[PDB]
Amino acid sequence: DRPRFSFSIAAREGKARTGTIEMKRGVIRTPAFMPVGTAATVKALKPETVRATGADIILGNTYHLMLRPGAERIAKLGGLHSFMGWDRPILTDSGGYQVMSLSSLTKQSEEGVTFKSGSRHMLSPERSIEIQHLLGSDIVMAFDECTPYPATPSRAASSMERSMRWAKRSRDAFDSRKEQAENAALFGIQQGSVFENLRQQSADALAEIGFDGYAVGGLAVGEGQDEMFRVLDFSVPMLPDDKPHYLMGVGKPDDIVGAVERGIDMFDCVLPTRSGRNGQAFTWDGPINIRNARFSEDLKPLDSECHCAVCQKWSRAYIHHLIRAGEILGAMLMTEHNIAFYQQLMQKIRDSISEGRFSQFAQDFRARYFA
Amino acid sequence: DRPRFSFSIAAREGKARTGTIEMKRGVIRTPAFMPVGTAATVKALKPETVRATGADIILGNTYHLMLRPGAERIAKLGGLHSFMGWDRPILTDSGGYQVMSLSSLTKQSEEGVTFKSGSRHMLSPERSIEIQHLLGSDIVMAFDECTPYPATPSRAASSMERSMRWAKRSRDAFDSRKEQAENAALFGIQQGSVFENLRQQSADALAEIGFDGYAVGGLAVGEGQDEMFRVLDFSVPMLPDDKPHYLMGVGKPDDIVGAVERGIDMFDCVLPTRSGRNGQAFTWDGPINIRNARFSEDLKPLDSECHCAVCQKWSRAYIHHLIRAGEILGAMLMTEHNIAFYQQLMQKIRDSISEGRFSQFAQDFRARYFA
Numbered sequence: 037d038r039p040r041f042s043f044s045i046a047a048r049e050g051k052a053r054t055g056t057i058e059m060k061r062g063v064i065r066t067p068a069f070m071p072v073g074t075a076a077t078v079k080a081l082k083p084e085t086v087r088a089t090g091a092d093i094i095l096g097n098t099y100h101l102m103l104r105p106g107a108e109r110i111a112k113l114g115g116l117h118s119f120m121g122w123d124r125p126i127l128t129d130s131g132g133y134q135v136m137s138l139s140s141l142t143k144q145s146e147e148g149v150t151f152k153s154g155s156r157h158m159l160s161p162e163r164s165i166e167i168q169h170l171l172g173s174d175i176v177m178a179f180d181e182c183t184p185y186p187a188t189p190s191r192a193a194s195s196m197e198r199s200m201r202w203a204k205r206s207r208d209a210f211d212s213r214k215e216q217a218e219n220a221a222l223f224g225i226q227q228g229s230v231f232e233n234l235r236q237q238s239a240d241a242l243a244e245i246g247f248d249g250y251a252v253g254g255l256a257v258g259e260g261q262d263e264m265f266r267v268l269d270f271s272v273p274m275l276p277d278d279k280p281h282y283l284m285g286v287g288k289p290d291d292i293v294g295a296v297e298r299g300i301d302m303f304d305c306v307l308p309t310r311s312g313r314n315g316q317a318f319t320w321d322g323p324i325n326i327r328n329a330r331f332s333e334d335l336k337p338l339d340s341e342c343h344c345a346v347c348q349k350w351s352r353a354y355i356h357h358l359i360r361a362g363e364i365l366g367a368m369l370m371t372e373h374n375i376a377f378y379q380q381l382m383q384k385i386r387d388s389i390s391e392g393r394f395s396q397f398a399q400d401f402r403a404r405y406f407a
Numbered sequence: 408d409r410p411r412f413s414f415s416i417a418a419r420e421g422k423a424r425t426g427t428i429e430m431k432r433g434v435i436r437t438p439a440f441m442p443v444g445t446a447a448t449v450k451a452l453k454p455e456t457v458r459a460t461g462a463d464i465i466l467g468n469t470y471h472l473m474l475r476p477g478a479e480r481i482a483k484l485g486g487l488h489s490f491m492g493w494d495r496p497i498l499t500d501s502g503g504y505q506v507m508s509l510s511s512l513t514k515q516s517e518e519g520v521t522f523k524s525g526s527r528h529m530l531s532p533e534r535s536i537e538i539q540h541l542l543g544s545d546i547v548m549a550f551d552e553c554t555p556y557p558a559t560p561s562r563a564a565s566s567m568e569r570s571m572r573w574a575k576r577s578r579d580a581f582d583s584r585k586e587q588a589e590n591a592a593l594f595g596i597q598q599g600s601v602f603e604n605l606r607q608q609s610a611d612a613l614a615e616i617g618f619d620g621y622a623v624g625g626l627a628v629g630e631g632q633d634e635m636f637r638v639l640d641f642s643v644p645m646l647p648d649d650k651p652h653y654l655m656g657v658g659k660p661d662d663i664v665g666a667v668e669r670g671i672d673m674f675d676c677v678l679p680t681r682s683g684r685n686g687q688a689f690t691w692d693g694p695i696n697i698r699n700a701r702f703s704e705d706l707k708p709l710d711s712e713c714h715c716a717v718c719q720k721w722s723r724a725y726i727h728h729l730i731r732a733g734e735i736l737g738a739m740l741m742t743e744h745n746i747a748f749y750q751q752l753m754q755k756i757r758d759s760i761s762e763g764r765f766s767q768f769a770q771d772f773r774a775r776y777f778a
């Protein structure tokens with residue numbers, strides 16, 4: 037049977053790596069893209085359709101499930117996997133992004149954060165880890181604060197220092213629960229805003245505690261690609277080489293390619309699902325907005341090479357009609373195609389690294405996607 | 408290869424019949440339930456999922472598709488079957504119900520009806536039949552007026568008489584288009600409100616013209632089950648015995664059972680799809696509203712005997728959560744289950760007639776459904 041957690045690197049090209057994470061509930065091929073399902077559903081898809089696109093793992097969120105349907109309720113019903121019908125690994129975020137994005141609803145202290153709708157709900161390192169246990173998460177995220185962007189060096193340091201104290205509390209809470217420690221994995225989250233010295237201090241603190249994987253937090257918060265890449269250039273090498281590197285919240289296809297070139301192994305983003313429902317379809321020739329009148333009589337599939345079931349069966353003209361009409365099937369088809377596109381991107385990335393031609397793939401990808 | 412149209416009755420019990428309609432695009436088992444897809448989609452279902460529930464034919468509508476995406480457009484794109492990805496028979500309504508339901512938007516005359524949004528669109532016997540040709544409909548409905556309910560005898564007679572003149576024009580328009588006459592079928596629609604003498608005059612006029620099937624129009628418009636059944640008691644025997652009998656707009660499960668007991672072979676209704684999206688699930692023990700708090704921790708499937716994929720995989724508690732949260736997957740799962748329930752009802756009806764035990768089935772069905 038599979039181990040609790042084993043990350044193996046099969047091939048490398050520059051800073052890019054490809055390999056596998058073995059866990060009890062399945063194997064995750066890296067670099068990996070995780071579809072997001074905050075409400076215990078990847079919006080508009082059955083789990084079997086998510087799997088048919090090639091996803092090996094999906095993301096849930098402590099914050100959203102605590103509010104609805106409730107963490108204790110999900111545990112009483114048999115856990116998140118059984119509840120939603122996804123039997124493979126699930127990574128759960130800790131709520132640390134909502135500490136920032138929903139801060140106007142909050143009172144924060146060294147002990148944690150209380151959110152006020154008028155109902156109140158508290159998160160802390162201990163309670164976040166407990167919720168993730170009740171959900172039955174396979175990859176548990178430390179409870180952090182996503183520092184707002186921009187941040188002054190002083191405020192970035194204060195925030196990062198609190199997150200590192202919270203990372204140690206997260207580690208100890210996870211380890212004190214035997215069933216969780218034996219069956220799940222725990223990832224730490226690096227903070228430090230855009231400042232190299234703070235990123236180094238954060239990496240050192242996380243490596244001293246020790247985690248199964250390391251996320252780069254605090255990015256994809258408005259800084260733009262040039263700045264994100266500049267921060268990744270120095271930040272990813274600070275993390276332990278032999279553990280997965282997870283860039284939280286990224287991103288557009290070109291963001292993913294450049295992040296892999298900088299040593300990232302895992303990604304999550306709502307872009308393919310949310311923007312799909314809004315009419316944006318990803319193609320090898322760049323995104324299109326299917327609502328545009330130019331598609332009303334276009335009999336081609338969304339993308340001319342895509343192998344997904346949507347592109348095998350339906351035209352741009354039909355999907356244009358569905359989205360314009362507000363039809364649920366439009367959201368279903370756009371979402372399936374976009375998630376399939378993202379997984380095909382990841383597959384091409386993995387194969388090109390394995391074959392030592394990833395730098396050429398990245399150049400070819402960009403030349404065509406931005407033509 | 409299959410004929411244009413052949414209806415065969417394999418077994419009978421009282422006024423109830425079971426058999427098949429053979430058409431070029433497939434076989435329809437009767438009594439049949441037709442899921443409704445007015446916008447070129449059965450809402451929230453891929454066609455393959457519609458088929459997996461057991462549906463042999465679906466319903467589209469001249470009126471809705473004329474407005475969006477347009478009849479000529481659908482023809483240019485290869486027809487409705489190719490457009491939406493359903494390759495089996497499609498029955499299209501003629502717009503005659505919208506002549507009544509949307510009458511405040513209309514100007515009516517002996518020549519037809521013009522609808523005003525501010526764009527204007529005209530329907531007539533000739534234009535309705537032409538639109539149904541452009542869509543590539545397999546069963547074409549005559550252009551009628553659905554008489555409002557209640558109606559005075561005078562107004563019911565005037566309306567019915569106009570519909571019969573329009574039925575003859577529909578017949579002649581259909582026959583004058585060789586490709587349509589050779590590959591599709593045409594059904595006439597009986598009117599006459601709740602009045603036996605007018606129903607008889609309408610049946611006689613339709614039989615004199617001659618049609619491939621006969622619909623009972625003008626019911627399921629607020630009259631209630633007792634009155635609907637009273638009208639069916641005398642109306643269905645007036646129609647040719649050897650052709651299908653289609654009750655437009657019916658209905659709830661008990662309405663379907665009683666209508667089959669009165670000689671109806673075909674049904675359409677938005678109830679399973681629309682009420683599914685609103686949280687109503689059909690079960691052998693009667694309908695339930697999945698939004699009710701009593702389902703929040705109920706691990707049973709929607710229905711304890713249902714063979715559908717939803718009942719094999721997900722609990723009431725999960726679907727309750729999805730519907731309460733407004734999640735698209737909730738609409739998808741409720742809809743698939745309800746359409747599957749309707750098809751299982753039709754299968755039990757067909758099997759019980761074939762075995763000469765339909766009267767016992769109807770009694771058992773009602774005892775349990777209304778317990």
Ligand SMILES: CNc1nc2c(CC[C@H]3O[C@@H](OC)[C@H](O)[C@@H]3O)c3nc(N)[nH]c(=O)c3cc2[nH]1
Nearest residue numbers: 074097129130132133182253254255256284285
């Ligand atoms: C979009 N860019 C971005 N996302 C981010 C997320 C995930 C939000 C998670 O919250 C929900 O999205 C609002 C989804 O579940 C998502 O996975 C982050 N999570 C944590 N714990 N810490 C971060 O520093 C952080 C930074 C992010 N930047």
Ligand SMILES: CNc1nc2c(CC[C@H]3O[C@@H](OC)[C@H](O)[C@@H]3O)c3nc(N)[nH]c(=O)c3cc2[nH]1
Nearest residue numbers: 445468500501503504553624625626627655656
């Ligand atoms: C609900 N009860 C009911 N439906 C009916 C429909 C279908 C409406 C069609 O219009 C759309 O629903 C508003 C769907 O496509 C539906 O199939 C009818 N159609 C015609 N042509 N003539 C009738 O006398 C008639 C009576 C009905 N009674």
Ligand SMILES: [Cl-]
Nearest residue numbers: 079306309310
């Ligand atoms: Cl989303």
Ligand SMILES: [Cl-]
Nearest residue numbers: 450677680681
């Ligand atoms: Cl509907």
Ligand SMILES: [Zn+2]
Nearest residue numbers: 342344347373
């Ligand atoms: Zn595709």
Ligand SMILES: [Zn+2]
Nearest residue numbers: 713715718744
């Ligand atoms: Zn079911």
